[PDB]
Design a protein around this ligand. Sequence first.
Ligand SMILES: [Cl-]
Lengths: 157, 157, 157
Amino acid sequence: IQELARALRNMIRTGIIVETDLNAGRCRVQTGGMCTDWLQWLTHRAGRSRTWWAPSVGEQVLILAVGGELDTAFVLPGIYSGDNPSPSVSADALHIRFPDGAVIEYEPETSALTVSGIKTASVTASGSVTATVPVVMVKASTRVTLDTPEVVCTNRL
Amino acid sequence: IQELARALRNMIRTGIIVETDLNAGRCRVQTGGMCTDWLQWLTHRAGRSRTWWAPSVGEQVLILAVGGELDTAFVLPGIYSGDNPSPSVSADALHIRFPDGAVIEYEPETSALTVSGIKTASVTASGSVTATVPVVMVKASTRVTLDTPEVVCTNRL
Amino acid sequence: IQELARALRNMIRTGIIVETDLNAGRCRVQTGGMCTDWLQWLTHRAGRSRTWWAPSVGEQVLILAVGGELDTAFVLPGIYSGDNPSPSVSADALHIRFPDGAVIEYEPETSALTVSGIKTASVTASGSVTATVPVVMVKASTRVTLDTPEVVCTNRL
Ligand SMILES: [Cl-]
């Protein structure tokens, strides 16, 4: 029958985000000769842990229709394109490129953890922050301020 | 035929996690008028790099059936709900909210990297940990301990 | 009809990565009695933010065919296997295991943020890096170097 085939071909589609609604957490997607209604996108976690990282206009995605009584569809980022190419060719590295030019990266080849291209950086811990490593370098252009009752240097200078 | 249509509608479904098996890495999901058998969930990576971040009871997910000789199905988190709403409305930020209230976040708008709401924090490196930035502030309520043969302050006090 | 059923069963498949092309960002996958052509894989983000974390040979994945005029298919990691088992059983923790043995982990149970098993670690910020916590420990086997015009210890020693 002719629409079982229509339902099957529309079950999984690919397309481009054309509009986002950050409050609703929904987007509209151009796929084939139409633009979808407002669809939710899948995120990494939406349970006891919750992630948020909104897809952007121009981002290529899959659209998965559930069909049935419900008949909703969901958006799943993301697919590399000419406009949005892979930011790396590394065999094993996790590489994250933010639109401000910042990079978060771990490269298992050199075992190098890299954060760069940012302005601010804050860690607020209630108990302990420790660091255990042969060499530590701080290159402060302005000054390092040590707001504490106490600093123990263990040996020499 | 009437079950091609049944297979098609059951190919992609949405539902809610009702039980987890952390040892097996499987979950059961309520979808429509039934609860699935124990299904594996998809994770970010399961190769040379491996991720683990178990979905939780109450989390809304997609279920994707492979059909065929195999006929298995897999669970894919996650979809925002009333119980589990988006933890942010930020246009570009990666925002992670843990159930202990901790937040990991980078906001490209302010280029601010944020870790907060945690107790402990440990970095164990075999070689070098360096930090290159104009201003550095440490606000230790108790004390900072510098267990090293040597600390070079490069200029003044 | 006999190939609506063939299209339906081939719509969603599972298989194993047998070859990768890091430049093209494509992989070939063994599924059933065949190996696919070069298929793109889905990544976390491919928009204003862009992620890269290539799947590896031996990694079990889903393959999603879009059918239709396009008829392409996309690869979605990842599924735990005997070769690539879950690196954790933790109820709430995000756990990342790199092939160099490094671990990135937050465990909400103990509220402990863990980075370990790495060699290098660099943060390059243009403005501020601050840290706000009762206890701070640095255990430098070799030396800590403070390349700054100024360090203010706020009280005592
Ligand atoms: Cl992800």
